[PDB]
Amino acid sequence: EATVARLQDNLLFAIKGISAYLYHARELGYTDEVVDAFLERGFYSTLTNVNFDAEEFVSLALEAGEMNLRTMKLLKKAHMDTYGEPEPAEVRVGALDGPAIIATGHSLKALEELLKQTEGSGVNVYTHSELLPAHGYPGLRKYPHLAGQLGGPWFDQRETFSRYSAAVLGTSNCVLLPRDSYRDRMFTCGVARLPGVEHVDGYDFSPVIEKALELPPLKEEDSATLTTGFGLSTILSLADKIKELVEEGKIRRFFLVGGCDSPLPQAKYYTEFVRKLPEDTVVLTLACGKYRFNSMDLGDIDGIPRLIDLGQCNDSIVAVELVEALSNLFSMDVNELPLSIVLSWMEQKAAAILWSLLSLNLRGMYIGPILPGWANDDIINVLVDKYELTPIGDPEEDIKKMME
Amino acid sequence: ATVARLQDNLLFAIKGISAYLYHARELGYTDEVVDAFLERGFYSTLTNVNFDAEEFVSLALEAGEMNLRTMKLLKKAHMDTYGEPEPAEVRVGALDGPAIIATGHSLKALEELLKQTEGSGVNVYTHSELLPAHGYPGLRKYPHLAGQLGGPWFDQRETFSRYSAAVLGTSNCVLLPRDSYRDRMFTCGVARLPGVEHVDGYDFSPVIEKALELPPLKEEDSATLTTGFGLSTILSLADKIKELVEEGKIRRFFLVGGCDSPLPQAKYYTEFVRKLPEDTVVLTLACGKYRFNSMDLGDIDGIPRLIDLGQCNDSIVAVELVEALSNLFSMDVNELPLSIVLSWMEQKAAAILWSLLSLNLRGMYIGPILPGWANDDIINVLVDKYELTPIGDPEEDIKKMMEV
């Protein structure tokens, strides 16, 4: 039927995300055999004339969410064991004088190697989109020529890359066909590829550095700031203040807003939402959706930041950790916390994280811009009604329903 | 459009590789580099990672290489657990008494079923790609493995209908039951059908119970088939074939086989071998062999005109056999007297075709014609560089294949 095809394609999307995280984990030298065996099994379950059962495909998607939790935890372990655990970090958004390299994507091993290969050369390495969290890691902020942030979300890149006479390095996910304005100024490594752009051999970034030096330098602009790298230790070392502040009702609610973004007009929702959120709530944010609002002056709530940047998409594992630290902190069940979840969700890119969240039986979440919601019975009707997954609507009404 | 089609083709190759890897892990054999390639390949098919078609072709060739590797590892597993396949005569027809018909590919489920059915009084029959099982010494040794019953996979609704026996689908190429036999079929491993029981692990007790609660089978007219031509058997006959091809009494090796379908165009493969001259030998693989593996081809000085290399994943022995033939004739691989006629489905057997292409075998003839194939960019692109030839008329194609 149609639903069997839709369900196997969704499982394949989850397997893709898990494989992304697994690839980056292997690049840092961490490998889990059980997740690889699940990749084999799950992908194999989608060959023609093997499995015709929709409910078994839902079971497989939930097992995929579990495996995604496993590999996200493994990748977090890799990142912390190589670069330290991320601590809060304010980051400059604007050009500094000099030659420059803009690195975009997810991988921190490529950024590590580039930063190692750019010492003393006098080129500034800027982060973009999901390389912003790198600024919070001790073993990465230590390089002083990691200048700051430049640009915002991934889908702005053709704009950003256009207006900065800097070398361009797409390390991983969410890369986009270059304008010929900067095509000959762009490079890729790892798995990312663009036709007509040079691909770095291994981690030998001489071609980019050379290019960065053949280019007119950047000129310093008026900048702005961002905050990122809120690692778990920082958050649950603040547990006393959060306890005291939510017991007196001076912090009413935690909202978890974030996820993979897109230039969809409906995604403007996430800018309005946090804008209308009452000033006595705190927002936990991750992945690219953060650029919908992470530049707003939200303020402080008794010295606790109203915006808390947990990092990149694969840092979902810290959020799920925090809630189990929060529940045990309040002696509450997981669904008794003053927590609402508003996802920004792409079907292709972040199916794995949604299925991980459903594996934990989290009820009443709000889903991404458009609803890929598989129209037919078993999926949308039965699965939504069981997990009470909710499509986003109007910001004010959604906030009213979430506060109650 | 070509990028999407190439991502789909790479994913099909990954499907085949993951199938073979799953069965190999089921027997306890794991190759880390094929799993790392699985990760990389999956990740390279995210929406905004790789936009380069030539790199997707390179990925498909790397997939062919990895498929050769995993087919080799699965052959190693099968041989280390069940022995090396020796030629085997196979009974095609029902013996009176309770019966279980097993279909699919992997022999571990069949091994456990045969282990669990000694003394119980049920006859175990093979179907489709479990026909090669009859050749493994450590598996044919069970005397209640009666023989074969039916032919290709698409015979099942026919076969399963007309034999009141239990039905066990261990693996690929199963399809929704007719209500005549729905309640007597079972599945294990990866296969699933809505409304059919799925065995837990390898506990086939429900199936044997059903085989004993059903009316028994009735005596057959009997027929024969031959299978299990393992490499060792063939290249112990290598001197004789050298002597016979230098004497010009056997002109050409044809390699005909692969995935079949209830497509009318697939009738080609019945006519082809029917028209083949009596001075050629046919090496056959997968289920397509049932187009002709029951024909009276005869002997060429005690060398069988039809030689059944086994099941799809046994392509690896053919790839070895030719490499033994070259060194035997002091010939390079593409001047040997060998023609190759694939029966090929893009979904099911992309991996073996890409393996054959990784080995730079030039001028093969490809599977059945699907009306839409003419415009399909993949056939065009494969043809232009590797001179793959679409099948046309059997007689004309053999004429063009012989006089070279």
Residue numbers in the entry:
A (entry chain A): 88 to 491
B (entry chain B): 89 to 492
What did the paper state?
Hybrid cluster proteins (HCPs) are unique Fe-S-O-type metallocluster (hybrid cluster)-containing enzymes. They play key roles in nitrogen metabolism, stress responses and protein S-nitrosylation in microorganisms under anaerobic conditions. Hybrid cluster proteins (HCPs) are Fe-S-O cluster-containing metalloenzymes in three distinct classes (class I and II: monomer, III: homodimer), all of which structurally related to homodimeric Ni, Fe-carbon monoxide dehydrogenases (CODHs). Here we show X-ray crystal structure of class III HCP from Methanothermobacter marburgensis (Mm HCP), demonstrating its homodimeric architecture structurally resembles those of CODHs.
The crystal structure of Mm HCP C67Y was determined at 3.0 Å resolution. This variant exhibited a homodimeric architecture identical to that of Mm HCP wild-type (WT), demonstrating the rigidity of the dimeric architecture. However, no electron density maps of rubredoxin and the [4Fe-4S] cluster-binding domains of Mm HCP C67Y were observed. This indicates that these regions were disordered, which could have been caused by the lack of the Cys ligand at position 67 in the [4Fe-4S] cluster. In Mm HCP C67Y, Glu434 was positioned at the solvent-exposed area, far from the hybrid cluster, although Glu434 of WT is a ligand of the hybrid cluster. Superimposing Mm HCP WT and C67Y showed that the regions around Glu434 and Trp461 were shifted by ~5.3–5.8 Å. Owing to the denaturation, the loop region around Glu434 became unstabilized and shifted to the solvent area, which may have been favourable because the hydrophilic residues, including Glu434, may compensate for the positions where the [4Fe-4S] cluster-binding domain of WT was occupied, resulting in the stabilisation of this area via networks of polar interactions with solvent waters. Mm HCP C67S and C67Y were less active than WT, as they exhibited lower kcat and higher KM values than WT. Considering similar spectral features of Mm HCP C67S and C67Y variants and the structure of Mm HCP C67Y, the lower activity was caused by the fact that Mm HCP C67S and C67Y variants had neither [4Fe-4S] cluster nor Glu-coordination to the hybrid cluster.
